[PDB]
Symmetry: D3
């Protein structure tokens, strides 16, 4: 039920080890991209929507909120509530924020837009992505800010399209 | 993945949920082989054993044979373990019958289970906690219920495995 | 322990944690005489506490035990920790030994502002209320001769009355 | 601390846990004088205690140390917890300082019925007995000037005799 | 519990927060010795070392001297460890000056740290993550803030231990 | 489907079977099916002091791929792939013949903290000794097995082992 419901493959569990795992899109294997150099942890699970492409050639990133951590390699059906827009040394870096669908858990039903998310969590997600790469030489992050679920769903749709034209 | 070295005496089990794990109900998508989140558990319970299935089996409900595998320390989701059945827990729920095989690792994996031949050899506290878990872990899932009928022995368990492997080949 | 009942009883109370949320199936209890953390028993169901679990020091309920408190936190606390919290309600039960009330509390706003909008148990996410109720109904199912009947939830006013009466009971015995 | 050595010594004794089973390679020890949990050393081999590890308060071995106890439990305990247990045997050993016997104990029946049939160390699964002996044989292999000589297992009566003798030594230091 | 065997060269540190632990900011009540929850972490950060204080010291701010203790694996809250200062991270926060000692276990506890004599001997990635942690762990605490000044050597660290131990004796 | 490495034999990909400091479960990838099987449960109370895995598309003399110990700052998970480079090799003999295990660190892209690690002598001595001690002893209670440690050799011999085994695999 794209773009309202999407499958996300988890790469990094919430509150996990400072290991930045990434799926190799060619082989489907979970590679270690790098070790984290700040003493920070992902406040949500982190993964991507398969068969998406976006402008920079990588799939659409998704932060998935769950009551307990997921494992790397798991797939979870979720729906977007907003998107954190950012710029870094490489250009734009949007990251969608999503909650599990109601079939997986009814506890997120009232979460429709990013302002519905507990404010403390929005702030720590923002802070994490502003700062987790601070000690990586040659990198910087600027937070443009949050946009709503329509823009998030717009980001999903365009990136699904970009992937379709390529293949 | 072969069903086992010496079916139905020794079988391979693919682990979906580790013992004492997070309240996340993972399931292998049989079509794609991917580990999906089916739902989050709504009771404060954990699986007292590892939980998985025998590949290339077709029980009556159209799903593979479920197996509880006792191990000394937790396994991880996605692992395959060779084991042998010591009994089977027979249940009914809203969809019909729901049997769960109980198994221990084969002697090659560990000599410590060698004296466990039947479910009656398993420590009573663990048998009771397994029954209680499957009786109650879905208590807060709307429209569901569980009735525990009781345990049957390894011969009965092996019959269930054999019957279900045959069903998979024809279907 | 030389710990006090709270910074502003019964609105803010100190709770000594015995069992962490999502912890090992070990039923630890503080020996009220010596202050040592003892293993009372191992749990016999495959269950875990959905919140942290402890007691208010210097309180005396009717049964001779301190007031029990369930403390919600964003991540688990450790056994032996003390946390300042405030009651939002109380789960009333009866068991084979008589009455068994347990207060539900959240950290004070000084400790964490994220709970400031939690004023009554009805503000707590419903799935957690149901999992707490289910845990206490069932965690002792395999303990011979024990049973639990859940009467229901009562509000912050009733919880504070239970605290105050039990603080009063303790002072009289001193 | 004011924790007593046991309700029905030597049949049931209180054990203060210093190191959890399968825990971090940190060798904690209670300062018997102050009751504080100190770091004695870090493990230098990649080994973990196959049981919980602690001691009986108010006991003194022939060399002046409290009686050490290995406590078997279904899940790990935490450092600093107290558990009532009963001895099923004792692994006799010596180290670079003298005697270093370790009692092996299971929770009392009040704490768990699952150990009721464990009466002697030979009732304990052989793999655990061997992993325990192997652990103490080797965990100090990389500590220069430290070693262990394993002298063998004895039954519950010998273990209870050591508890009683050790309680007597402790009382004699107050007498 | 004394300040240490040979102050200021070897000191006892009581651990309040483990390395890589839960985002719970525990603090010992210096009056009673009880481990209280001071607050929860509001950024997604964890302490890159263990964190605690030296008993029987009186810093300028009225609290004991804080110490960051490097260990190969995490310690637990409430444990005491004999250690020695290799340097000090100088900072100021909302309450004033706030130096934190960096220490390693003494050679009796672990010989792996014997060649660590100054903070410059500590791996650079760890020095940087420590600096980054204290720069940012109060970013979402309204009315709390930190400015990180820089590192000073073991002698200056020992000067601080001695200065703060002196105040405790007269007071 | 994973290749042997970006720049063999200087940089190789390693598939992790057993994480550092993990459960005493001896996982192994089935080279035929690619599935992670439980080979056995460990019978000593020991843990791998590094992560443990193998280089895909290699064949050593014993018919198994080249085994690699991978040092990381925090544990990896079973099934992860890590780009690394050899700094030495632990040579042993057992009941089955020769048993070399290469020691590797992450490449500089993954972590700059190992850049100065060029040979096994660069590795902290305590870790080298604990690795040696682990492989000498973790199979002590496995019947019919024994280990003799011949010793460590340098990165050139390690790469020679890698290079020959890549050829042997192609051949
Ligand atoms: Na079934
Ligand atoms: Na030695
Ligand atoms: Na040592
Ligand atoms: Na601030």
């Amino acid at each position: 039920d794209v773009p309202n419901e999407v499958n996300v493959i988890i790469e990094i569990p919430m509150h996990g080890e400072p290991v930045k795992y990434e799926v190799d899109k060619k082989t489907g294997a979970l590679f270690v991209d790098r070790f984290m150099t700040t003493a920070m942890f992902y406040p949500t699970n982190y993964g991507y929507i398969p068969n998406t492409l976006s402008e920079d050639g990588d799939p659409v990133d998704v932060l998935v909120i769950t009551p307990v951590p997921l494992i790397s390699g798991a797939v979870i059906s979720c729906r977007a509530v907003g998107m954190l827009k950012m710029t870094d040394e490489s250009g734009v870096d949007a990251k969608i924020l999503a909650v599990p669908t109601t079939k997986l858990s009814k506890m997120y039903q009232s979460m429709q837009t990013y302002q519905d998310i507990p404010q403390h969590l929005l702030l720590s997600i923002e802070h994490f992505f502003k700062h987790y790469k601070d000690l990586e030489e040659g990198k910087w992050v600027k937070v443009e800010g949050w946009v709503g679920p329509d823009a998030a769903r717009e980001e999903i749709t365009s990136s699904i399209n970009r992937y379709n034209h390529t293949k």
